Paper text:
Here we describe the 3-D structure and catalytic center of the defining member, EnvSia156, of this sialidase family. We show, through ligand complexes with products and sialidase inhibitors, that the 3-D structure and active center are indeed an unusual arrangement, with family-conserved histidine and aspartate residues defining the catalytic mechanism that acts with inversion of anomeric configuration; facets not previously observed in the canon of literature for sialidases. The catalytic domain (residues 6–376) comprises a complete (β/α)8-barrel fold while the C-terminal domain (residues 377–502) consists of an eight-stranded β-sandwich. Here we show that [name] sialidases define a distinct paradigm for sialidase action with His and Asp acting as Brønsted acid and base, respectively, in an inverting mechanism that is unique amongst all exo-sialidases described to date.
To explore the 3-D structure and molecular determinants supporting the unique catalytic mechanism described by Chuzel et al. 26, the structure of EnvSia156 was determined on its own and in complex with N-acetylneuraminic acid (Neu5Ac), N-glycolylneuraminic acid (Neu5Gc), 2-keto-3-deoxy-d-glycero-d-galacto-nononic acid (KDN), and the inhibitor DANA. The absence of related 3-D structures dictated the need for a selenomethionine approach to phasing, so a selenomethionine derivative was crystallized and data collected at three different wavelengths (selenium peak, inflection, and high-energy remote). The resulting refined SeMet structure was subsequently used as the starting model for refinement of unliganded EnvSia156 and complexes with 20 mM Neu5Ac, Neu5Gc, DANA, KDN. Two copies of the protein were present in the asymmetric unit, each composed of two distinct domains. The two copies appear to be related by non-crystallographic symmetry resulting in a dimer, discussed below in light of the interface analysis and SEC-MALLS results. By coloring the structure according to homology, using the same color scheme as in the alignment, it is possible to identify a highly conserved pocket on the “N-terminal” face of the (β/α)8-barrel that sits at both ends of the continuous groove formed by the dimer. Considering its position and conservation, this site is a likely candidate to represent the EnvSia156 catalytic center. The identified conserved pocket indeed shows the presence of three 100% conserved arginines (Arg129, Arg 202, and Arg246), hinting at a sialoside-binding region, although one of them, Arg246, seems to be too buried to be able to interact with the carboxylate moiety of sialic acid. EnvSia156 also displays several highly conserved hydrophobic residues forming a pocket that could potentially accommodate the aglycone moiety of the sialoside substrates.
Numbering used by the authors:
A (entry chain B), B (entry chain A): 6 to 432, 434 to 502
Write the structure that this text describes.
């Protein structure tokens, strides 16, 4: 009964369906796969710097496009030949839909409500994909013509260095033009402000002024949706995607607690940016912070599952690891699981055959109960400029030294098997090299565990945990090594 | 004004006054030094595992003590000869005060009340000094006799490994016995549960059971003090010391938000343990978390000022660095500055001559306004077991890489000088080796800055900050190096 909010990105459908002349029937059919699942909202994303629909106030993705032209034309010249094919798949599908009189978002909204699903629009507030390429097809001419409105003029080490400065009146007006249009054109149940594309909206050091600025921006959004409530004749919700930890959120100018108390938002999605799902987010603290605000707290997952920032592994969540994350987050008080990058092809879980099952399971403690789950230790990819970073992995244990990992495994395990599993980097160990404890209780060596994807490319050793040791919420692995070892990977596998 | 809470420890007064037969008059005069200052409460600590007064339910410090005996007597046998002198200083001074019919805490309370100070009692809930020495004079026989009631049977790597487990009913009953005595013996304005001595009260992994357990204990303490409120004829306060971040506090089984909303406490002191004052604590988040509960939030300082956990420096805070910390925390919303280990001698500030100045200044932004101050980058000493740790220093910058440090400098500087100062560990920089920006603005090279204590034992390079670049709250130092460099120190010096 918590249920699922599922984000469809601005590019995905247009990439994957490229080369088909799409009917209105086919466009409608995309919604159907979500019908009869635990999905309660579809977060339809229509924009990056450019819109995928035929905007009057912004550049559509197909501005500058020669439909009959060669791949090597001005709009695509700046890409290597192979990437032209994929960009043009997005540009042409988006364009051809418009040429055929099909507004893909109007059709998805309408179809959502026939299928009992609540349709939302989710705007990317500050997308910066490929800003290293000034001539790239998907940048707005507004962005190309106005380098003075970027965040960081004194260097370029990161894409976010060329993000728009929301400190500027010009930049806010530019984003509010898109919103006024989205509210006029589309009869959505709610508008999501997606600050998490890419999280960085202010000059470094100006984030406190920025906080006051984004609260006032949010209030205008609410004030405008209140008008459209009267025009549409039903309630319109306003939500936002913000960082996973309160301090990082306030440090990037997102004072969501003020938004919630002033009645500006009624949904908050705490989430990472992209590098990895966070299996561990302080939901319970957010729940105290939002007490009495009537706001729906949504725990955001991302498709990637990686143990540390610098890992060369780029594997996605499985059904078992989303069951793990979802079990934990609901256990902590998440009033929704929110999927970002869990689409029906290309950007999707590694085990796509289990997507129907995933959408019928991860929305409830009841539907996860007694099912194989994996609770994997990751990290938070987004920190406010100069904020010290807390990254568990990797972790060296010198001989006779103790190392601890806390992993959130949510509901107490049902009768069955519990493994603490630990991967060791380098090139290894005896069954008495580690001493492994969970909540103080000795764990028996099991040996090499053969993991399903996602899995590291180094040995993973399994440790059998006494059932009764496991608690509700966090559980503590404690480990001492007789030899110096680097841990690259930690998890609990629970098999009832 | 917010004002000052000042903690006098269980040991200090008896250590420093050893060797003099003390008169009631001299005992009383100790309170007078705190009269007419911004000090509002004295937090008078009367215990570790043993009491400094003549307790009838716990061991006084002098249990085992032969007044007439040689230093080499069974109570002090386990210490090296020259530490027996200091130990016996405390024990003898404490013991002699009882024999002269002087109750130091009854007199202090009384004298506080005459000099318009609010007198508190602060109990150490789980002190473990020197628990490596099971024969040590300051451990309770109850501790010595009950190894099975400790937190961690499976290893001894830290003193907190031999702390009492409040998971056990006999451990809570043991501490409730002293509270029942302290409430009957002493007519205090409030009782402070000092959980931060040493902050670790539960078996590793049981900290969520712990949360329910400490809340139910705190409630019992509140119900007890409600009885004494009726006998004493006036309101009795309950406060507590807890970790500096909300996740770490809940992670150590201290759910102070529950305590506050259920009206169990009316004061909370966010604080480090010992290793360094924290110049940066999320006061503003605690203020949101505590909204409507009627609790006073106090920001706790410690006397040490150290850049990172493993630094070999052990210098203390100065008047300038305490003004720095105090300006910041008060700006962030602290309703009190709390000092721990800032006493009149031995354990105190490096510049003791400035103690009367400090006690009339750091309680208000008004009295701090227009005075030199130093905002030094430190670190949180205390993390929940297996909680990922965020430590800013030391920081390596590779050639052509960017490193940022956010430092909280509180109120916008008045007209005058601002220096960003950066200390470099290991073996030779030029005036262009570093590019230093504050809030994006270029800072001019100044050269080697000769710092007042506290100061690192490596070169400190100063950068002149355009006055107008400084903002209220955090200020961001960005630096890129042309050579690989490790930073061991970072501060803002503001000179009005």
């Amino acid at each position: 009964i918590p249920g699922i909010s599922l984000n469809e990105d601005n590019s995905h459908y247009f990439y994957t369906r490229a080369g088909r002349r799409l009917s209105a029937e086919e466009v409608d059919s995309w919604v159907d796969q979500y019908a009869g699942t635990q999905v309660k909202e579809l977060m339809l994303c229509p924009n990056c710097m450019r819109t995928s629909y035929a905007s009057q106030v912004w550049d559509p993705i197909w501005r500058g496009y020669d439909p009959a032209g060669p791949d090597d034309q001005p709009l695509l010249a700046s890409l290597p030949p192979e990437e032209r094919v994929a960009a043009r798949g997005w540009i042409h599908t988006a364009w051809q839909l418009h040429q055929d009189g099909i507004d893909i978002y109007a059709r998805w909204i309408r179809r959502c409500r026939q299928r009992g699903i609540s349709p939302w629009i989710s705007m990317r507030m500050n997308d910066v994909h490929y800003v290293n390429d000034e001539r790239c097809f998907l940048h707005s001419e507004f962005w190309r013509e106005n380098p003075q409105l970027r965040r960081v003029p004194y260097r370029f080490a990161e894409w976010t260095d060329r993000a728009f400065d929301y400190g500027r009146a010009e930049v806010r007006e530019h984003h509010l033009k898109l919103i006024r249009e989205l509210a006029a054109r589309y009869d959505f149940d709610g508008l999501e402000l997606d600050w998490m594309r890419f999280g960085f909206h202010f000059r470094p050091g100006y984030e406190a002024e920025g906080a006051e600025i984004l609260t006032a921006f949010t209030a205008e959004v609410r004030r405008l949706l209140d008008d459209w409530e009267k025009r549409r004749g039903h309630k319109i919700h306003l939500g936002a995607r913000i960082p996973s930890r309160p301090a990082t959120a306030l440090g990037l100018g997102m004072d969501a607690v003020t938004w919630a108390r002033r009645g500006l938002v009624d949904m908050l999605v705490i989430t990472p940016f992209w590098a990895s799902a966070e299996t561990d987010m302080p939901v319970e603290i957010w729940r105290q912070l939002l007490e009495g605000t009537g706001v729906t707290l949504a725990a955001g997952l991302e498709v990637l599952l990686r143990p540390y920032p610098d890992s060369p592994l780029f594997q996605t969540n499985s059904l078992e690891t989303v069951r793990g994350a979802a079990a934990s987050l609901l256990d902590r008080g998440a009033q929704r699981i929110y999927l970002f990058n869990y689409m029906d092809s290309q950007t999707a879980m590694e085990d796509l055959e289990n997507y129907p099952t995933l959408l019928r399971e991860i929305g409830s403690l009841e539907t996860l109960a007694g099912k194989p789950r994996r609770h994997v230790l990751t990290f938070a990819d987004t920190w406010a400029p100069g904020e010290p970073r807390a990254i568990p992995l990797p972790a060296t244990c010198r001989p006779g030294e103790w190392r601890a990992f806390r992993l959130h495994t949510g509901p107490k395990p049902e009768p069955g098997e519990v493994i603490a599993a630990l991967g060791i980097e380098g090139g290894a160990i005896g069954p008495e090299t580690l001493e492994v404890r969970v909540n103080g209780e000795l764990c028996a060596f099991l040996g090499l565990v053969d993991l399903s994807k996602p899995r590291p490319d180094f040995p993973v050793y399994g440790f059998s945990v006494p059932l009764a040791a496991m608690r509700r919420g966090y559980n503590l692995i404690e480990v001492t090594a007789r030899q110096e070892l680097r841990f690259g990977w930690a998890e609990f596998l629970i098999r009832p």
